[PDB]
Structures are given as C-alpha cells and as structure tokens.
C-alpha cells in the first residue's frame, strides 16, 4: 500500500520526537527507505526489510526464512507488511533505542540538511 | 537562415497524455516525415542553437519506447531543436546501470553530431506541456519536475532523475556520472552532488508546465534497489574524480538505425 507524505505523518505521530528525531526526519526518511510502501520488501544480503520502515528479520523480526533471528522487536515480520503502523512503529522505537536513527542509512546522507520541504502542510 | 525564436510558436502548451490506444510506430513514422533515418530532425525555417541528443537508457521496455516516440517527436519538433533520439540498450543479464548507459549515450552520440545540449530522459516519462522545453540552461536543468507518480509535486528538491539537461560543459565539468550505480536508486542522487561540489545549481520548470506523465509498470528484474546507494552517495566528492567520463569501458555490439531512433547495444561489463 503506496501512503504519502501527509498520512505518513498522521500515522507516524506517536513517533515524534523519540531519541530526538522528528517527523521532518522522518518523513525524509521513509521516503528513501520505503518511498511509503507499507508492503515494500526489498532484499539486502541473506537478510530481508520489511516495510515502511524496513525493518531486518537479521536481527529484529522473525521471518519463516530466518527462525533463528533474535527476533528483537518479538514479532513477525509478515506483521510489518500489512496497513496497520502500530507494531512497525513499536519495533522502530526499539531500533532507536538499541542501535539508533543510523540503522536507517538514509539519514545521514539524505536528511541531514533541507527538513523544512518534508512536512505535511495539511491538517 | 533565421535564428530560431528564444520561445516556439508552435507550442501549443498541456496535453493529454493516455496509454491505451495502441501505437503503431509505421503511422508514427508516417505522422512524422520530417524525422530522418536515425531519428534525427532538424528545422527547415529556422537555425535553432540547441542541438540537442536525447539519450535513453533501456532494456526489455519497446512497448514504452513507442508511445515515448509517438509522444516526444512532434514535441520536440514543436520545441525548433535539431535533435537525435538515442536508445542505449544493456545487453546481458547483469543489473541495470542507468547512469552508465547515460555516459555511454553521451560518448556514442558525440559521434554523429557535434551535439552541444544533452536530455537524458527515461524512457517512461512524457512531458505534459510542451513549454517543458528539452534543452539546456545557463544550470544544470531537471525536467521531469512534476509527475504524476508523486502527485505532480517534486518529491525532493535535491531530486535529479527522470529527466535532465546538461550542456557538454557542464556534463565534462562534473566527469560526466558514475559507472558505479548498479541496481535501482542514488545514481540521479549521486550526480546532483556532483553538480554541488562543482559550484552548479538546479534550473527547473514551475510546477504546472513540468506535470509529467509516467507510464505505470511493475519493479524491473536485475534492478533492485542497491543496498549500497547510501554509501556510495556519501563519497561522491572523492570517488567522482575516478569514476565518470574518465574511467568508461564498454563494447558497442550494435548500432541500429531505425527511421524514428538510433538503438546502441552495449556491453557495459558487471559490478566489479
Ligand atoms: O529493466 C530495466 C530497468 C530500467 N530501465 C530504464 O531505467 C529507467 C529507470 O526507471 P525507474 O523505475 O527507476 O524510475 P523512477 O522511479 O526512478 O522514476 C527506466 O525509465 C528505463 O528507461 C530499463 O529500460 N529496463
Ligand atoms: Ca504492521
């Protein structure tokens, strides 16, 4: 499911601010790591994302290819596949907390300067 | 014997643009005289000062390629530039190197004409304005400004693909782009960097004459998203001194003059 900009960040509201990333960060980031596809999945090494956020089954959820993963965030990652933000965004607050806003590798690179363009001018 | 005018008389400004009426390339042709063997036309009233290669990256995408013809011909001609349309085809299995069949597009190109303008346009975005005019600027020009795919707004202002403009001296002056882009993305982010670290800017159409239409298909095989892009664009400033125009290798295994196009098969070799 292709979302936007604006419901990203309607969605995405309780991430606000967490480990001091904003919804401008955010939005920027998602857009080079997902482009806000809810059912991206793209393969990386021996590991697969999953989702908007991309979140690794290396590492972070359990995947019925890698059953051995430490499963981190304690979920499917088929879970992150779906319309439904809630435990993307729980496992994504875990990411932040163990790892930090590096693990998205889009960060720095992409939204590091320029935020003002990525918020939603809607209400 | 006239210089052409700074804006055409024959633009006639949005268009509607569907692909579901088949096309034809024989009527195509046919709809289009005045476009030589090759596709290359040039203005019988006027002189224009763009001269102008278009250069498309492909593989596997004819049914794009037609209404892309169809579409761009009588625009470009409406536009007074003397043009040639370039197709540069990966051959092999290997992923999708756009920005290096681009490079390739400009070495191949160069030897035909003396161009001196460069559009490098995939081969699935159509203009919906003919004022969206596909030239080159006193900046590097993005053109494919306002698609539909991202609700005709730019996605980022830092946003490069699609398709752009660059005069040969701005292109020779960043080393042209990166052979190193393998898979899907960061390639356009890449050169957009190249551009910054060479004290050039972003020239860009408004909004309403940039809308652009792309023709909707499905995630290409043998181009996946690079897992690397981000790395890669992080290092531009260095890695664009030995990788670019400078450092290109291929082999030209065909060179096919159609009456609308001139299709370049390439080996362009794998990720080393
Ligand atoms: O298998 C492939 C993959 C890509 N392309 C070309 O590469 C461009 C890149 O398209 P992409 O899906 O990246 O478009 P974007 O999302 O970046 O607008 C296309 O327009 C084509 O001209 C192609 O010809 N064959
Ligand atoms: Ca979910």
Same mark, same amino acid.
């Given at each position: 499911t292709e979302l936007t900009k604006c419901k990203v960040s309607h969605a995405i509201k309780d991430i606000d601010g967490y480990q001091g990333i904003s919804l401008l960060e955010w939005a920027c980031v998602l857009f080079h790591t997902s482009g806000y596809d809810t059912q991206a999945v793209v393969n990386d090494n021996g590991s697969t994302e999953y989702g908007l956020?991309?979140?690794?089954?290396?590492?972070?959820?359990?995947?019925?290819? =890698? %059953?051995?993963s430490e499963n981190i965030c304690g979920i499917s990652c088929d879970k992150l596949l779906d319309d439904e933000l809630d435990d993307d965004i729980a496992c994504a607050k875990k990411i932040l907390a163990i790892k930090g806003i590096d693990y998205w590798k889009a960060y720095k690179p992409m939204c590091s300067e320029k935020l003002e363009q990525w918020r939603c001018e809607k209400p | 014997l006239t210089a052409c005018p700074e804006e055409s008389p024959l633009l006639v400004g949005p268009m509607l643009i569907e692909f579901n009426i088949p096309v034809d390339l024989k009527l195509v042709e046919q709809q289009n005289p005045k476009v030589k063997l090759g596709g290359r036309y040039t203005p019988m009233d006027c002189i224009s000062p763009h001269k102008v290669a278009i250069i498309i990256?492909?593989?596997?995408?004819?049914?794009?390629? +037609?209404?892309?013809?169809?579409?761009?011909?009588?625009?470009?001609?409406? $536009? $007074? !530039?003397?043009?040639?349309?370039?197709?540069?085809?990966?051959?092999?299995?290997?992923? =999708?190197?756009?920005? +290096?069949? !681009?490079?390739?597009?400009?070495?191949?190109?160069?030897?035909?004409?003396?161009?001196?303008?460069?559009?490098?346009?995939?081969?699935? !975005?159509?203009?919906?304005?003919?004022?969206?005019?596909?030239?080159?600027?006193?900046? %590097?020009?993005?053109?494919?400004?306002?698609?539909?795919?991202?609700?005709?707004? !730019?996605?980022?202002?830092?946003?490069?693909?699609?398709?752009?403009?660059?005069?040969? $001296?701005?292109?020779?002056?960043?080393?042209?782009?990166?052979? *190193?882009?393998?898979?899907?993305?960061?390639?356009?982010?890449?050169?957009?960097?190249?551009?910054?670290?060479?004290?050039?800017?972003?020239?860009?159409? *408004?909004?309403?004459?940039? +809308?652009?239409?792309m023709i909707r298909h499905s995630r290409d095989k043998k181009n996946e998203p690079n897992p690397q892009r981000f790395d890669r664009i992080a290092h531009t400033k260095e890695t664009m001194l030995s990788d670019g125009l400078n450092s290109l290798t291929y082999m030209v295994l065909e060179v096919q003059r159609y009456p609308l196009y001139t299709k370049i098969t390439v080996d362009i070799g794998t990720p080393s």
């Open positions: 956020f991309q979140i690794s089954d290396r590492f972070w959820c359990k995947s019925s290819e =890698f %059953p051995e | 990256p492909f593989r596997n995408r004819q049914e794009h390629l +037609k209404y892309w013809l169809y579409y761009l011909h009588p625009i470009l001609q409406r $536009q $007074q !530039l003397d043009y040639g349309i370039y197709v540069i085809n990966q051959a092999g299995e290997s992923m =999708f190197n756009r920005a +290096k069949l !681009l490079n390739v597009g400009f070495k191949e190109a160069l030897k035909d004409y003396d161009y001196n303008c460069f559009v490098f346009s995939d081969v699935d !975005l159509i203009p919906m304005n003919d004022h969206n005019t596909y030239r080159c600027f006193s900046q %590097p020009r993005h053109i494919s400004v306002a698609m539909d795919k991202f609700g005709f707004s !730019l996605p980022y202002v830092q946003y490069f693909g699609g398709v752009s403009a660059l005069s040969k $001296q701005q292109f020779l002056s960043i080393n042209g782009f990166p052979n *190193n882009y393998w898979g899907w993305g960061g390639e356009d982010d890449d050169i957009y960097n190249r551009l910054a670290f060479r004290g050039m800017s972003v020239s860009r159409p *408004n909004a309403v004459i940039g +809308k652009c239409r």
